[PDB]
Design a protein around this ligand. Structure first.
Ligand SMILES: [Cl-]
Ligand SMILES: [Cl-]
Ligand SMILES: [Cl-]
Ligand SMILES: [Cl-]
Ligand SMILES: [Cl-]
Ligand SMILES: [Cl-]
Ligand SMILES: [Cl-]
Ligand SMILES: [Cl-]
Ligand SMILES: [Cl-]
Ligand SMILES: [Cl-]
Ligand SMILES: [Cl-]
Ligand SMILES: [Cl-]
Ligand SMILES: [Mg+2]
Ligand SMILES: [Mg+2]
Ligand SMILES: [Mg+2]
Lengths: 537, 537, 537
């Protein structure tokens, strides 16, 4: 592999190279104790760590994982937690202990969990009260799974008490001398067909890339950033963790147990958050609140990712707050790929210019660069030199990795147009992936869930336009002859509840259309593009 | 004149006959919007026109020239611009408006400009920031000069703002019904003695000739060609403009502000350029770069003109890239005269066979055809029928035109040998013209510059062999007795700087030899041939 | 793996980094054309390459391999050639083309070859007339084997003509940008039990290690070295190739078709060889010749490896020639491990001090360092940092690699004592490996060969002391009851011929003892140590 070769130091570790620099600055008296992590639950509990405390407590976390739990360098650890401090501590702990962290959403059902534990052959899971039961439904079928660590006020037979072990642990752990290319994280990522793939990131593709992008958000050393994210998304590691800590800035975490926009607004108004990051829906939701009542003159930087930002949202936000929203763009495999930086003119409807050292282009069917103003596929040049930030590949599936390289370019799977200044406009997914709010949904995940129901003999799942949410999961369902006599509204509701019971509810089909047939290729494949084309005007 | 008579239609215009065919194909839906002009500055700005846009924008250009500027059919327009899109637009505009365009290099000094404006009696000049000051030094002495159009981000008192007028102009202009033999361009061309002559080309000698040669380069309709040229050279009109547009292909333009070979290499590697054209120096420079690092597997056709291609350059290029270089040959008066086409065997050291409908021969002192393997003068048969592509003659100087006809043959002024297959080998200039890289230098231009200095009482300028550049300008200088005590290296440097200050720097004498005398004919002419003979071994 | 981590540049390639430096020095005029390879056949043919010619001709070799043969980066190439220039060219060619070369001896029989081709899944073999027939006996059973390249004056159906393709090939090849840790060579190496393992070396463990040791032999830039070696031994790559070429010195190769000591002596006397390297047997053989008749006052450096140098050989050599022999020590996995350098006092019976950056120690059963004067196992410290020069591991067998690490130390498998100055004395093999002259013999290889014969129902192969050769292969053979009536001298001769017919003849048992039984552990293993102990007094 020319792919494995990069322009990187032999060794890199975000914890020892970045976080412990700040800890050492404090200890040496060269910087005052500076807030690193500020967590609130919105019910009167708050916690704050400075960089020395964060380093000490994450060293304890690494001692729990490597010492009490006996996990060894290279072991894979599923992490499925709400927005609690232990998420940040445990990730840092894995980084310190040379363990591969694998974040997932607390929305996951038992089948989602079993798929991931079996595929990854995880040695450990760190979970909270939200998924303990779902984990225990399937853990017996996971022969590799040896450690269950629970983050909770409760104890549970079979699970180790993370919070108790952390307090018992030493605040000294010797950071593993991890290699730049060594596996650090696995993120499961949905595909255009089939079930989620394991996208492997290295110590450098996450942490060195973040160190190089540090400040892209407008954030500075003495500021506070609030990234609003599910802890399972790669957004959480890149923006909630690595962006602020590369700068020695504070990251702000609200438990946000119900995603309540009035709570978000009161939080912005009551805490001195200078920068925020959330998906476009966050800003859309906030705009439906009374912004006149909860001012936030301390807020300066508003960034977004995950779905295209409507010029209308941008307009309304500027009108109600006086602030810009600066769009960014990326995927799990590539991290931050394009963005509008704090010094760039904003062009409504465009998501900015190439990030970092990426050579991002619009390319043709042959993999050749197209001129400005021509629609094609968005790619990043990865040959002959793979830039810092691109993932290591799909785990156990180098053919899938190679499949997505066209000529010298990694394909994002998005259509786009580049203007005369190099700014990109998103022109839609080039494949069958569905983007519902932040979430990336593979149609086979949803089709499979539906097919389990006895009513469904065939189904195609596509994206569908929505006025409030933008894009939703829609299912075309062919019924067993027996269910033709059933009330469609009743059966739709039943099918939706079924999908929500069996897989993470964010994937459920908000729209179901019953049909007698679905269009087929001569190989018998459903023509989703054809259905999507009709569906979107 | 039997000379004026040709086998041509009564009317021809490249813009209406060729360019607007492609524009109309797009508009009619018979061809998809196809790239015509793709310009980059190498700092992140790119612009592309399709054939409809190119036609619209050049119609605007013609409206600026004929409408806002009041220029009338037959008016002569000096064009002195860098490699910016407005060069292509303005030339097309002149073609549309039946205006005689007269390109020159941005390397020109005020004296060069005044000579050309006064000789031509130009009504207009189109210039950029590179020469505005030089133009303004002398414009008051040019009574015919009425319009100064500046292509710039700046405005300047006395100059019309081309870019602003173009945007204000209509995209509809009715193309002048120009005659086949009507003057379209004047190119100033250096002579063996004296100062540059005005070589007049017609609508047909440029555009119909190009239409007939279309594809000689190997270029096809859906390809991109990069011709690397000074915009003042006739090479730019024939290969950067007319060759690709006769085919409906895209022409690629890089500003290339510094002629940086690493920039050329990165450009070849990063853009899907299928054909390239440059003088041999371009390929020589590229060969000194790391071609292993910047591959260009999309490149298929490499053509050259302007200086003889060393078999060594040909060899090295094939070794490092796997590609041939196909040589071509021509002069300002004749356009493309010989070449190696894409289907011809390459014979190293030969420049191919007669182009187009040219009867190219080696001829004797009487104007008779010589057998293969005999050195003589290269000529094109122009009587009794002057072939399409030969210029109309030297403006105001029909005696100079006639002087260069020997029997039935136009003399190229080069020596050559023709082989058994009709392939020509260049055997050197037959006169005192100096060829330094692409540039054709008349010795009187350089001698005159030198004589202006008080040290120089006599001088002869000849070509001299050079290992790196091939051929250079050398001056023999007889000193005023007063300067005999001066340090020669100091005075050489001073004389070189003087020549560079007074005339386009490409002509400067890279070598100066101080001598006490120069050999004279009985008419008192310096014997340059004698000096050149000694100089070249 | 902390093992994979090293203090090395990301990229290394001996050909581009070392050899092409010397080639470029010549081309740039900064060094005169300097001999690189001087080959003689001892019948009046000689050939010499300078560094430019060596680079050109090896670039041709790389073009044969990658171009004509279509071999791709990472493909494995068996090389089985006599001492001809094409060995050096082909190895360099593989290095340039990022191909894994796998040298073996021309003494190999068809079964030896099939084992290696099947184990390695080689895509190609480069062979000469010595093994073509043996290769063709088994090549059909090697589904991965696609290319057979023959180095010969003859052509053979099925084999490509290497010498013809090389001459047809371009002298320009763009060196692959190989990684420091990327596989460069596989050497098959015998084990204490079972059949030979694949020892993988990297671009850096061979070439960067050699660059760092360059000159250990006493060799300088303007000298000639003669390494006397089978081309299959790692000695050939480290000392015949990399040591002289790291220095810009000449390597001298004599075909030496019969290993004739009078030929070696006449060669030393007739050519200005300043340094020589051979196994102790070379010097022993030379000492039986008339050194008074063939003086070599130009010879300055005599080095040895492969078997312990008797103080008697050292003494006799000094007495007859006035020269020292400087001992070195290493194995396939470790390269040059200890040696007596040109500035070190020679202590008869000791093999010098740790090479390069190796921390070489005598260690106990726990892996702890022992004091001077205590016998233990020779080890190299490989944790936490594996030094440059240690191989990458056994291919497909990381458990075998790990098996030989005791604590933080790679085990050489030799016993030794270290003196107060750090000099090591060899105290014998710690396992069942047999060292006969240069050759390392695994007993299972020989036992297996013998067991194929119907007379042999059981056998143990051990080392045995020999006055002339030092150590020989001895077989204990238990006979089938049917062969008890056979003449032992006849049957011994027959068994020896059998072993020589089926496997490389260097392994054959020079001594056979017929016995009625062999001592067994409670697991039923033959106690070879017990037999060897009795055998050696
Ligand atoms: Cl909105
Ligand atoms: Cl406001
Ligand atoms: Cl997701
Ligand atoms: Cl590139
Ligand atoms: Cl050259
Ligand atoms: Cl090539
Ligand atoms: Cl005729
Ligand atoms: Cl010119
Ligand atoms: Cl001896
Ligand atoms: Cl002696
Ligand atoms: Cl140590
Ligand atoms: Cl061996
Ligand atoms: Mg069903
Ligand atoms: Mg003068
Ligand atoms: Mg037997």
């Amino acid at each position: 592999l020319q792919w494995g070769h990069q322009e990187v130091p032999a060794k890199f570790n975000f914890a020892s190279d970045v976080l412990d620099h700040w800890a050492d600055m404090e200890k040496a008296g060269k910087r005052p104790p500076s807030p690193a992590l500020w967590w609130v639950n919105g019910k009167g509990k708050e916690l704050m760590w400075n960089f020395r405390e964060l380093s000490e407590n994450s060293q304890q976390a690494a001692n729990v994982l490597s010492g009490a739990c006996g996990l060894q360098r290279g072991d894979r650890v599923a992490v499925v937690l709400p927005r609690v401090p232990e998420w940040w501590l445990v990730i840092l702990g894995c980084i310190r202990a040379g363990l591969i962290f694998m974040p997932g959403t607390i929305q996951m059902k038992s089948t989602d969990i079993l798929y991931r534990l079996q595929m990854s052959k995880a040695k450990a899971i760190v979970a909270g009260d939200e998924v303990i039961q779902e984990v225990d439904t399937v853990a017996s079928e996971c022969p590799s799974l040896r450690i269950k660590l629970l983050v909770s006020e409760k104890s549970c037979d079979g699970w180790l008490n993370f919070k108790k072990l952390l307090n018992e642990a030493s605040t000294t752990h010797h950071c593993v001398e991890t290699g730049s290319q060594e596996a650090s994280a696995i993120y499961f990522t949905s595909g255009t067909s089939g079930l989620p793939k394991m996208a492997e990131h290295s110590y450098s593709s996450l942490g060195l890339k973040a160190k190089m992008d540090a400040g892209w958000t407008g954030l500075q050393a003495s500021d506070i950033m609030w990234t609003i994210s599910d802890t399972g998304w790669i957004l959480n590691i890149l923006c909630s963790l690595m962006e602020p800590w590369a700068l020695g800035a504070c990251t702000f975490v609200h438990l946000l147990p119900k995603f309540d926009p009035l709570v978000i607004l009161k939080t912005l108004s009551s805490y001195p958050i200078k920068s925020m990051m959330g998906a476009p829906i966050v800003y859309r939701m906030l705009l439906q609140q009374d912004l006149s009542s909860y001012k936030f003159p301390h807020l300066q930087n508003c960034v977004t990712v995950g779905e295209s930002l409507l010029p209308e949202t941008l307009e309304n936000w500027r009108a109600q707050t006086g602030l810009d929203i600066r769009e960014s763009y990326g995927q799990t495999e590539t991290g931050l790929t394009c963005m509008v930086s704090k010094t760039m003119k904003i062009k409504p409807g465009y998501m900015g210019t190439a990030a970092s050292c990426y050579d991002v282009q619009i390319i043709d069917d042959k993999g050749n660069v197209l001129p400005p103003g021509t629609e094609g596929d968005i790619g990043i040049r990865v040959k002959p030199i793979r830039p810092i930030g691109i993932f290591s590949g799909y785990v156990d599936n180098p053919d899938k990795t190679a499949a997505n390289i066209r000529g010298d370019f990694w394909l994002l799977g998005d259509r786009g147009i580049k203007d005369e200044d190099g700014y990109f406009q998103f022109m839609g997914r080039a494949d069958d992936i569905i983007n519902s709010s932040g979430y990336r949904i593979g149609p086979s995940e949803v089709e499979n869930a539906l097919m389990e129901h006895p009513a469904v003999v065939e189904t195609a799942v596509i994206s569908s336009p929505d006025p409030v949410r933008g894009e939703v999961v829609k299912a075309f369902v062919v019924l067993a002859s027996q269910f033709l006599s059933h009330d469609p509204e009743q059966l739709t509701k039943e099918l939706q509840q079924h999908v929500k019971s069996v897989t993470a509810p964010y994937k459920y089909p908000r729209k179901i259309e019953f049909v007698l047939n679905l269009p087929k290729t001569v190989t018998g494949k459903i023509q989703r593009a054809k259905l999507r084309d009709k569906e979107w005007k």
